[PDB]
Amino acid sequence: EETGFELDKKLGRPHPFIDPTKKKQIETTLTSDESWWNWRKPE
Amino acid sequence: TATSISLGIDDLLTIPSKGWLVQDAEQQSLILEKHHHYGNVHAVEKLRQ
């Protein structure tokens, strides 16, 4: 058997929906200057 | 009668994502209205949106 995650998920015990060790960091996105209007943050 | 179905205030369950969707719609509506004042879109485009 496994331990920690993939064991709480198997047994239904409280655990994050997404494995923290497998959570990819979200890449950098448009910085309100590579983006058109209507998608920029209102500042 | 035995089960006695009955609706309360909190029984009127709302979609969890209504707050997000309404807030997203307001942001689009506010941004578009601001540029309509600037003159980047015309009245019909604002009306349709």
Next chain:
Amino acid sequence: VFTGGTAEHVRAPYNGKIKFNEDLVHPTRTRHGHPAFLCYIDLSVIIES
């Protein structure tokens, strides 16, 4: 009412950034005034969540 037909909105099923080649699509202005792309091929977009 304004699109003159049946319109379906493809909504993002996951948070993240969208990767696609903007050259494969043609620039256009929507009926709401927002700039957008017109897709004439079977374009596949990537949502990196």
Next chain:
Amino acid sequence: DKDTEDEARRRNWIERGWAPWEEILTPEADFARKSLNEGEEVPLQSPEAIEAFKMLRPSYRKKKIKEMGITEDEWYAKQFEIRGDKPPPLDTS
């Protein structure tokens, strides 16, 4: 009678005080005037409309400014240049 689009224009200048003053448009406003000509929801075919579409991103503005050799403030000053034919130069004798 009537008035062609050469005497009504003259009438506007003389009587109505008309003048085709320059309009320094934002990239969003400039795109509106170059894209609504082609229709409502159509692929932009005019190169002016296509270029106006690309200028909606100020990042794309930097590339053109950098490529043509401008300190990014002359470009902000170039957009205010008077458009149209210049008047004949004065020779005060």
